[PDB]
Amino acid sequence: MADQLTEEQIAEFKEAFSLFDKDGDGTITTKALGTVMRSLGQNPTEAELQDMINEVNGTIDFPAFLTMMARKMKDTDSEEEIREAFRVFDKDGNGYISAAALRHVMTNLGEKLTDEEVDEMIREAGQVNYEAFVQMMTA
Amino acid sequence: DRVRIFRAEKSYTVQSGRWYFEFEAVTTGEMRVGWARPELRPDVELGADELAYVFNGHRGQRWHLGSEPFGRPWQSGDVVGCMIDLTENTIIFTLNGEVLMSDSGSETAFREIEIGDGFLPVCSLGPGQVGHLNLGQDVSSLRFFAICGLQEGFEPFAINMQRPVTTWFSKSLPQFEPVPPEHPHYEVARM
Amino acid sequence: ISHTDLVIGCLVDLATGLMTFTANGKESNTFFQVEPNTKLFPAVFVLPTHQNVIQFELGKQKNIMPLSAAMFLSERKNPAPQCPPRLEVQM
Amino acid sequence: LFAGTEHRAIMVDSMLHTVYRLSRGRSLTKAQRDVIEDCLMALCRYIRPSMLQHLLRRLVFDVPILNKMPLKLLTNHYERCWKYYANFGVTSEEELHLTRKLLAHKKYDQELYRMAMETLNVIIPEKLDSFINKFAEYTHEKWAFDKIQNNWSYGENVDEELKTHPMLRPYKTFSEKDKEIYRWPIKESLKAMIAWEWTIEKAREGEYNPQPPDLSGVTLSRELQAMAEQLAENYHNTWGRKKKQELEALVPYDTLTAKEKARDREKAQELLKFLQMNGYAVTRIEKRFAFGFLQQLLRWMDISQEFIAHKFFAKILLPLINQYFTNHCLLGSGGHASNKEKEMITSLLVRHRVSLFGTDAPTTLFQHIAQHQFGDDVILDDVQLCSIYSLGTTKNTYVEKLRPAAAAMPVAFLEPQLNETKSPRERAILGVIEITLPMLCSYLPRWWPPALPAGAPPPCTAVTSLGNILRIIVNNLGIDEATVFAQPIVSRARPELLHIPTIGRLRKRAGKVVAEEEQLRLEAKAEAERDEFSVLCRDLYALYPLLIRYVDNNRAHWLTEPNANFRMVGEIFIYWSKSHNFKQNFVVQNEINNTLKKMLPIGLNMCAPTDMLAKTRYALKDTDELQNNLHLQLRWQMALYRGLEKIVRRVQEVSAVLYHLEQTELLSKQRRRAVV
Lengths: 139, 191, 91, 676
Prior knowledge:
- This is part of a larger assembly, with one copy of chain A and three copies of chain B.
- By secondary structure, chain A is an all-alpha fold.
- Chain A has helices at residues 7-19, 30-38, 46-55, 62-87, 115-122, 131-138, and strands spanning 97-98, 127-128.
- Chain A is built from six helices and two strands; from the N terminus they run H-H-H-H-E-H-E-H.
- Chain A has a two-stranded antiparallel ribbon.
- Chain B is mainly β.
- Chain B has no helices and 14 strands.
- The relative contact order of chain B is 0.26.
- Chain A: Ca(2+) 3 binds at residues 90, 92, 94, 96, 101.
């Protein structure tokens, strides 16, 4: 799903891609793919370069370029989302969220979870930490 | 030589209730008292296999499939009671009327023991050690039972027995015996 | 390291109590003589050093009856070697 | 499933190496290497540490000298904390290597503290040409002695099934074609012994079934075993450089195995015994850590004053953590004491925890007296900085309890303590006739801040020594009966409730319980009726008072049942309703905790049962269905024992039992990422 990127990145990507576009076709060389990411500050080595082209002839087209841009920014946000997800629980922001302050924040979020499952969330997990909570949520 | 193992006859096994006896230790050292399964092998050290539950009074540790430190070691002339409660799978050791505790403070030396075929009291005397085993025929002949064990609910062992309980000791004289077919090292084959 | 099997056979004469021992059919120097009314069990003592160690062989020689006739009063006249299940190896 | 591989240990030894061979590489990404590094530590567990040292010899070769890297440090710490409840020298080699290395700085101290528990150009002399033939002749003298014992035949061609040895002769009976197998080897080893220590000369006299002589007549001395250790490594250096040259066109000596060093050492112990003939003898654990520790301690206080006047500080933090590690992990006793006095002047939190550790691990009397003088000077300032003294005020009291497991200077501070953080001042205080007068003084005060402080050392003094302590307890009884600082007051209460006097305490505490019982019943009446929070507060204060109340009740019961096995019957009856009231009351109790209500019912159970149990079983049923009217509405052995107001007393114990009886009594996968 290519929707996980916001607009201005694609605006920045197309600005970067058209800057190194070969003839305006939207084709670039295999080398220029490395240079254009380092033109965007991203510095992956040839290991992260090699597996991406064979995932998709030396001719990189702009949708074929963009689908690789989705996956490189999908994995990084997938792990940094869950610590800031725990930030709203604890009043301080460290990881010390009291279990008393959970059974009204969890029945009031909008996935329509009733009292039985937020119970079932808890007794199959005092204040619990964050890293056990990112373990008990991802499962 | 080796260590002598003392127990009661295999008729006297228990399957339920809560029971108790006493054991005076005259000269301390290597001795061992506790409770054992009825099918007890006389070759093994008392408590090394899964057939015994037995406290050691030399350095204050319990023996079952190994060791773990437990309570104070001995003096010369102190009473070491033992009691079991099959209704809750517990084994409790009392010293001088005072209940011994673990390193964690827990008094129950062993929990969650399977009942199985039963249990029966067992002693063990090292070389030189002298100590008599009051199995509890006369209730007044006991000493520290009234302090602990009486109002808890534990009955003594020989509470209503007009004859004393016969005792079985392990010999030292080797005798011949047929080789068991489930022997782990040796096996025969009549061809 | 011997690649051959040392076979030791023994000889017990009941009406005299004279006991002798043969080593691969070659008679050894030793011998033994006992009291009149005494019994004896056949015996082998061994410290094992192999996967296969010894074999008790209940056989007869050229003109003497095997151990089956010795220990069963119903079969004292039979020279055929037998091994009924009452016979076994103790330890 | 790999638990206990005594079935096989070679395939897993090769497999454990090629995993770490694939650990660092040029053709792998972050994703693929994280699979392997998680596969490695998953195999570092679930196997016995017998086979673990097969790679641990190889890791300490590579990592600990350099600050890839964390892949070593991770697997290391998961094995050194795997048996703490040969390779050991390699670890200590790595331990000093990591110290030589001392973000990445924080990734090291965890794994560290977890482990805290020329021959061709060398000239040959005149006897060296005689020794290269004699160590060739004695080699043929020992080899024919060994083979012929295992029935080795004689053949012109050396056959393995025939066990033929065509070299079954001496080196003096061998030509250049039959001594060339022992020409270069006995000449390069003598050249390696000469290039290591230039001593190739004769200084002593000399010493087919060829038999070697008794070369083990003299053993290895302090200079001979070190030279035999120098001959094994030099034979390993020349053959090891030969292996590094041949395979390009790898095991050292000190970090060798327990099995590899057994076969390599016979090449030097027999060669030094062969060199010892004809006079050609070439003759040239924790305290080491403590030595470097004191060496670091000198540079620390030197740098501490260097910053006081105005890299290593992180290393100081790295050391203090290891110092706190080794102290908890625990001639040499003086060296620690030397460092103990070294750090104390540097103070004149992180180090203080290590200081508390080092004080718990227990010349210095001058340091003690200077501190005691600094304390009294601070006490002069206290009567009139504070941070450096308050940390010293606990470290001393730590030490004052440590040594129990400059007397005037201590006595000077005692008067200073008596002069004027009051509880902390009362804390280190406990750590004759003048005390005896004060004993009756507080007794008069109890008959009626520093009152709490004075009783602390008084409890410490009477315990150092009978009825005097019995008077002090009764003095402590009425003080609480009138009544915070009751917590530390209770801390000394259970410390000496050892040694009639109990009966006086029984008559005293029975009133104490009943007053608490009335206070409980009042709160119960308050519970029967904002005022809800006030009743919750009042019960909390009541629970607070009950905390120090039951604490002395336990140890006193440890002599009452010892004696009586009367007044305890009242004490059981009084504490009965307390447990009944304990049966929201617990809600206030649990917050007060952040138990004694349980254990009080335990000791009283034996006493209450000391005073027909079917009726007790029946009355328990009505108390689980007031019942006092319902109470109004082996045994031969037992009656032999029991013989050796009943309607209410049986009703009393019955409900206590039933109260005690009551006392002892999915999501789908996309839903999980949705709620995240």
